[PDB]
Amino acid sequence: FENRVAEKQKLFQEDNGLPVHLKGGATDNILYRVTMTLCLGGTLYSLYCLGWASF
Amino acid sequence: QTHAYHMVNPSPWPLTGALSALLMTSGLTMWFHFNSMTLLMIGLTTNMLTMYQWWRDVIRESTFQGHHTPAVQKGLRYGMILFIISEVLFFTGFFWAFYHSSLAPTPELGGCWPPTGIHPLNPLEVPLLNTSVLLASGVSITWAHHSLMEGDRKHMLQALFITITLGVYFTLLQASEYYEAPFTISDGVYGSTFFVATGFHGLHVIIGSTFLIVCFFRQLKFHFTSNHHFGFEAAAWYWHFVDVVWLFLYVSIYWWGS
Amino acid sequence: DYALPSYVDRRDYPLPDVAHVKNLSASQKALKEKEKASWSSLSIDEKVELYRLKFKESFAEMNRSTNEWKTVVGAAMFFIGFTALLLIWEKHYVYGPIPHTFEEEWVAKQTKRMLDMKVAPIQGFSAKWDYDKNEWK
Amino acid sequence: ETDEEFDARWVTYFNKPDIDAWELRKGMNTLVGYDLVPEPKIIDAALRACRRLNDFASAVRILEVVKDKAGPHKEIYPYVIQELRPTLNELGISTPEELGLD
Amino acid sequence: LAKPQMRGLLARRLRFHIVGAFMVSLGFATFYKFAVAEKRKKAYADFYRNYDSMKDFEEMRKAGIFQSAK
Amino acid sequence: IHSLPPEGKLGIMELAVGLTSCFVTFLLPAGWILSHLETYRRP
Amino acid sequence: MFINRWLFSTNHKDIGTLYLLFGAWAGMVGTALSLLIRAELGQPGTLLGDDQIYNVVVTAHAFVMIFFMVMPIMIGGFGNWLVPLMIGAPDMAFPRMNNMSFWLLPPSFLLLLASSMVEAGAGTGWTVYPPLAGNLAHAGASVDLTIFSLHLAGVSSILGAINFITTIINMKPPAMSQYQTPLFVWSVMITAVLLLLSLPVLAAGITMLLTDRNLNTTFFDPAGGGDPILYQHLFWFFGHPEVYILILPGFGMISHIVTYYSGKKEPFGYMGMVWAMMSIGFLGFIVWAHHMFTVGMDVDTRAYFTSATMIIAIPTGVKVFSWLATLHGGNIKWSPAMMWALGFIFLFTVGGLTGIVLANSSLDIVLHDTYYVVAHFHYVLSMGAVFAIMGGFVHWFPLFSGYTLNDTWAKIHFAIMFVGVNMTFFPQHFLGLSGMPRRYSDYPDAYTMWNTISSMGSFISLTAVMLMVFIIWEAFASKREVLTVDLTTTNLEWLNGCPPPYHTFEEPTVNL
Amino acid sequence: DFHDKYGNAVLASGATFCVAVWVYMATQIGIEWNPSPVGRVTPKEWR
Amino acid sequence: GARTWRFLTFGLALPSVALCTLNSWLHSGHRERPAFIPYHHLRIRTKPFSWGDGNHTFFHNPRVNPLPTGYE
Amino acid sequence: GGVPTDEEQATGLEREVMLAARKGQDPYNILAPKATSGTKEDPNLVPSITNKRIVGCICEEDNSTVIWFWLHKGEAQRCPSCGTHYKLVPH
Amino acid sequence: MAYPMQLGFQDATSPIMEELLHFHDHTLMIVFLISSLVLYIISLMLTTKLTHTSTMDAQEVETIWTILPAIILILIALPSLRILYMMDEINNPSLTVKTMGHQWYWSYEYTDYEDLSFDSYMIPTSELKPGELRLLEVDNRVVLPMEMTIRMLVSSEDVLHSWAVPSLGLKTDAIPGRLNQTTLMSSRPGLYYGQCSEICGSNHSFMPIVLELVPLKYFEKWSASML
Amino acid sequence: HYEEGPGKNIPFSVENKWRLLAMMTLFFGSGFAAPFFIVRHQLLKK
Amino acid sequence: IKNYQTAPFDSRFPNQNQTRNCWQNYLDFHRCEKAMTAKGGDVSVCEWYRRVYKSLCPISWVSTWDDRRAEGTFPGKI
């Protein structure tokens, strides 16, 4: 392996106004959309389950 | 700013993490009472994806953006020590439950410890091996730490690899011990204390090993400097904690209670 | 102007950091100018504007007693009064009848029985009934 | 410290030839924090400082604070006004009462 | 006008009413010990001095309160 | 401590609607449910 | 921008605001529950219908008031808002983790609501004691949903405690020692260190009930050799420190309020109060068994717990007699906040004193599980904790919002509440001494008068809560901004204006 | 202020309403207060 | 330093692990199963497990873990 | 070898703090400033990036009370409690 | 039992409960002093125009703060512990009775010489014969001999309950798998009531305890006739 | 930059006093109502 | 040597928890029964323990223990 930290430092310090969780690129946006879709969807589902259980 | 502290970018992980907690607890309830693991499965996936994305961002903020000034690093040190303290207190509750049940065996157990019908694992058999394994990994991780400080990449990786192999070895040994144990979690206040205490400990060993594996990869990628490597320090403090808890479990649960 | 010294009327901080009026107009600027020579020659009216340029309320005014306490006490008692309306509503629409053990032909008998079993004979209850004269002491 | 030493350190303080307005405010504001209606000797020295500072208004607040500090005791301010009647008349100082600020 | 007292008027007040405060609070003492505490101790000693447990039981039995003694 | 004069002065009819909104909108859900408790009991 | 600001926050002020909002909402729920309790006891007989619905109401009332109202407001709300400002810090040490401590509360609250709707709810008491909370006495998901709520509330307070203790030790100006930090900051730290060391024991304990209920373990089942009393020890080992966690930030705010409205630059005896809050926090971890005086412990163990419990009075008395000494010689400003603080001093003292009566294991035999205990804790909680919260709220509302409340309305609110809580809880002392048990849906006829009066006091309190909501509207409706705050030289949190900028202390403040 | 003009009329009117509606509640709506029979109840024979 | 710890990883720690590994592996053998006695405190079932048939423990080993009714 | 040093790899604010300490400066306020005699001629000089900085004055060592106030650009000001003098200077 | 509008403790039926009444009255005098002194001091601090706002030193004020409150907490502990130990003194019982708590009733066992077991249920309000206290009467009372030391053993067959009789100063937890002991001794004959004192479900409110104290002779006859 | 000043550091808007009464009456009154609707659900079931 | 009223105070078990007292005298009646029969000694003399376990032990405990000794599952050593 070779030291590529400098390349990563350049990428993450690039003044594009992006928040650290999306500054890595398009994948961050794909990975963040997947974590958000599952979290909210799963919450809606838990609410539904609380309905079925309570009644 | 003219202070050395870190103003963190607005982040979605605290929310995804909190929601994943709701999904896991909701999930456990659904599993225990409405025979379904769907909710539970979703909770565990979103916890791991929030945690990858939370710790990934911490690495980006420190190694890549330079936000970890000495002041920020000294706060993280206090944070990790405090976290470990709370983990110690958590285990203390389990030891309290063991030294309550053991030092006054109730008539249902025959009035003596170990309870009638219980045939404990010999302390000197596999449990002693587990003990040498963790103590040995405590030595190898110290070698890894010194290698890193001395700027020795190869030996740091070598020592760290050995530490991880040992943690895995312990995990495999414990898994095997669980399977061959003649007693189960449903066998009274002996099986209860034994499996819940060693079970939470085994969980911490898996968490600790994972933490060390993260360090191994970050090391492979040259993230650590010979002077700045808090992630490794935290992983090592956590590892020693896991080691010390084991020493208390072997002395009390096995040697004293067999 | 949060960062700047401000004026305050306080008994224990008699001399504030600034003046109450800071943008002196021409008439006021001249009162400040008359302050320069013997004070005997400042009339009683300039001597009050000089004072009024420097401070906002005199000690007497700043330490006045008000009629607020009447409004507070009477409003508190109108709203405690309003609470009774809620209680009236509750007894009327929520509460059903109480147990039959409260009716007089029952609370009498029960009393006779409590006296018979000598409930609290030293001080509390039976101690209050004259067993000889057969009546409440 | 002793009454007489305490009294002299403030007489000395207000008797400084070049008092800056800031020290006059600091001295009076500090002095009223203590459980003592200041001695007539201290207040007159303070009154004289407000003259070297051409500050009438402060001379009147200084005579209001002395009355305030006495509180229930209603005999402290009439004695103080009498002892400082020579300074008030000479400086041209009208009491809070005459001005009608009472 | 005579020079009145000008120093320590807050402290002087506190000291005086400090003497008062104990007297109001211990005012409950020599007294609550007399209207509740000594009345209870005297009322129990008086009640049991010439108390006849069998006579008391006989009265209760004749009144019919018992399930095991008619 | 001091406060500025209000940018809009509150009238009597402005406070009357506001104060009766605070009381009525808690007592109406509490009232309709606590009154009809015997009706839920019958099955 | 709305989502980034309010859902993805990493700002201590905004996060403190979220906590204040959550706690205010929780308080409405807890008040409703307390009204249902007092409605059922308002007259002899049965109202809600069955005892199980009552024992579910009582349990939820406690959980909501403690975990969702008091802690979030004091620690998450006032703590997050004020701590960084009082030490001149730019934010908390872990601003992102801080946001998770908040977001864990709504899910935690949802689980509590879920438990009281599925099956027959969890009518176990907030202490949740096995065997009643087991899988035979209370079978079904209710108790399990309750346990999961306490875990999320505990993870939230442990990840809040770590943040507060790190921020307070590591982020003060270089020249400022710990003994130059305000008393509220010291109150939050000794609360955080008690949360850190107690809630893991609770977590251990409730995890063991969970396994006893679902994995066939027998930690507390007598048939399998376990012991129901073990749970009590584990619970109360957390339980007592918990009550000090509920009052410590209150003590901190009271010190600030009393000093401020006395026109003082500092509280009396700063170092004695710092020592008293360090003692009330160390003693709080060796007295737990006073909640178990009737379970059948040895007499020597009971003599020890009686004695250790009464030593907690000496530290709490070097605070009371310091607050009075702070008032001493002050230029008293009779603001609404001051009124709440004065009521706190007196009412907390009364509640603390009845606590010293209960410390005596001999007497506790007769007072335990009776309304005398309920009287005791409502004086320290419903009057102590709550008055500190109300006082702090009216005092700092102008700072947080930039608007000033109507003082007269605030004084009217205080008067109504004062009458309400005293009428509600004072008569409960009588009910306790005379033997009325706790957790009882109905009572013997002799207890009728005091229970009626107590229930009518609870309605007076309801009137005060409704008025408070109106008062907050009125402030936001009129929009009267804050011109000048007095005493900023000794109250740093006000020095950046009202409300302070989203980013304060970008340029830090101090000579050595 | 508001207080000088109408304060006396608030202490008076408000207190009279509180004493009234409360007196009405305690005596006209049938609340059972269950006072001590000492003095009031003439005992009657239970058996 | 690193040198002392490298030796301890390879010449004391690992050798200790080696002696013990052989100790457990050679001194092992599957255990002999005791007679099944229906002791009431053991094999507790207050609620069925959330897996399988609800009657077999998570890491159930048929050779050594009897069911409440006796070895299968 | 093979392990990077801070000198080769530190970046961002971490690097700035590092390089500055080598030159003996404190741009990020990590150290507590030492007081002068605090007289008008030698005022404690408070460095600031703008036209105001908050000053906290611990008047006498062992004071538990800190006196806070804003220092503004222009002439010197005195602590409202002990009178010691401070003046704002450019960063 | 408690009577309408009761302010304090039910009249003492045992020597120990008498002991507690006198101890409580002493503790209330100390609450009455420090709670009314604090209220008086608050009013004293708030009723003067005189001020002192400069630093007040807690030099010697601190010494009284720690040394004096320690002395009162001793004046309350000494009689409290005297009573505590007194309740644990060896009792020499003449009879042993056991009570088992159940989900919503108590059962009793007098198995010294022959079995005399029975259940004790609350008499429903509807079936309460005129004059019977609501929620307090039971079908079978705990007949016991007066003026005799009795050993009561308490346990439970389900959840936790708590066996209490206020007039005797008793409250002992009923815990499954555990046998708790307490000693009863009535100075007088009569009926003494108590109620379950540990939340046990939907009918905690409805499972009272009623002791019937009679002379030895009657106790014996009753014994016989109940087997 | 996040807007600053009074009425702008909150998640709800304070610009109309009558919309704020409506939002706040629902936020606070919905919390008070919820415990009573749990008691209806619990009684209604059985 | 009897004329027993009730089980005396035992110094060994002097607190409130008397679970062990009951257990011990249940076990010891049975242990003495076994020991006496071996030395052809009267089992009429282990009755002091019987009187003391019957007095102290809840009937359901004794009943459960007896059922278990018969089933072969008594936890204790008799």
Ligand code: HEA
């Ligand atoms: C902080 C804790 C707290 C508070 C404030 C209260 C307040 C009240 N409680 Fe209590 N209560 C408990 C904690 C609390 N309680 C606990 C722990 C139990 C025991 C549970 C068990 O046994 O398991 C209990 C039990 C309990 C019982 C005994 C039940 C039984 O044994 O059967 C009763 C009976 O009257 C009762 C009544 C009330 C009443 C009428 C109030 C009223 O005073 C309430 C009035 C309203 C308020 C004081 C809330 C106001 C605050 C806000 C709304 C926030 C405002 C917003 C901002 C300022 C931002 N409570």
Ligand code: HEA
């Ligand atoms: C804010 C919460 C809070 C606080 C501060 C306290 C404070 C104290 N508490 Fe309490 N308590 C509770 C909340 C609290 N408690 C709750 C929720 C329960 C019931 C839980 C349950 O079981 O459901 C409970 C129950 C409880 C019990 C268990 C009773 C029982 O059920 O058996 C006991 C035991 O003694 C106790 C004692 C004390 C003592 C000695 C203090 C001391 O801190 C008080 C000391 C203060 C003073 C004494 C007054 C000020 C001091 C002076 C003026 C100096 C001079 C005084 C003397 C010399 C005495 N309380």
Ligand SMILES: CCCCC/C=C\C/C=C/C/C=C\C/C=C\CCCC(=O)O[C@H](COC(=O)CCCCCCCCCCCCCCCCC)COP(=O)(O)OCCN
């Ligand atoms: C070998 C090293 C690996 C160690 C871990 C082992 C694997 C499974 C368990 C995971 C560990 C994590 C936590 C679980 C702890 C408690 C119980 C599990 C202990 C355990 O793992 O032990 C097993 C129990 O299995 C069972 O029930 C398993 C059932 C699992 C369900 C767990 C339910 C969740 C409980 C935790 C609740 C959440 C709260 C946690 C604390 C948070 C505080 C805020 C033993 O099996 P056995 O065959 O019965 O014995 C051997 C017989 N031949």
Ligand SMILES: CCCCCC/C=C\CCCCCCCCCC(=O)O[C@H](COC(=O)CCCCCCCCCCCCCCC)COP(=O)(O)OC[C@@H](O)CO
């Ligand atoms: C996959 C198996 C399934 C089981 C689930 C468990 C899995 C997940 C948990 C494993 C832990 C992984 C943690 C990875 C952390 C990586 C991020 C990190 O370590 O971040 C570091 C900061 O420390 C920091 O925040 C340190 C912070 C560390 C916090 C982690 C603590 C442990 C987490 C505990 C989780 C649950 C606890 C158990 C409760 C029952 C990075 O800073 P530096 O190293 O200074 O770099 C700077 C230099 O490089 C500059 O040149």
Ligand SMILES: CCCCCC/C=C\CCCCCCCCCC(=O)O[C@H](COC(=O)CCCCCCCCCCCCCCC)COP(=O)(O)OC[C@@H](O)CO
């Ligand atoms: C199923 C039954 C219950 C389940 C409940 C589960 C609850 C939550 C699950 C999801 C949480 C996982 C997500 C990762 C959290 C990491 C937090 C962390 O790592 O926080 C760090 C600080 O705490 C530190 O170091 C010091 C401490 C590290 C804390 C690690 C967090 C683990 C969370 C579990 C805690 C359990 C408590 C243990 C006691 C029993 C970083 O702080 P930030 O503010 O981010 O950044 C600051 C920047 O300057 C960094 O560049």
Ligand SMILES: [Cu+2]
């Ligand atoms: Cu406690």
Ligand SMILES: [Cu+2]
């Ligand atoms: Cu019960």
Ligand SMILES: [Cu+2]
């Ligand atoms: Cu009960």
Ligand SMILES: [Mg+2]
């Ligand atoms: Mg209890």
Ligand code: NA
């Ligand atoms: Na009722």
Ligand SMILES: [Zn+2]
């Ligand atoms: Zn200074």
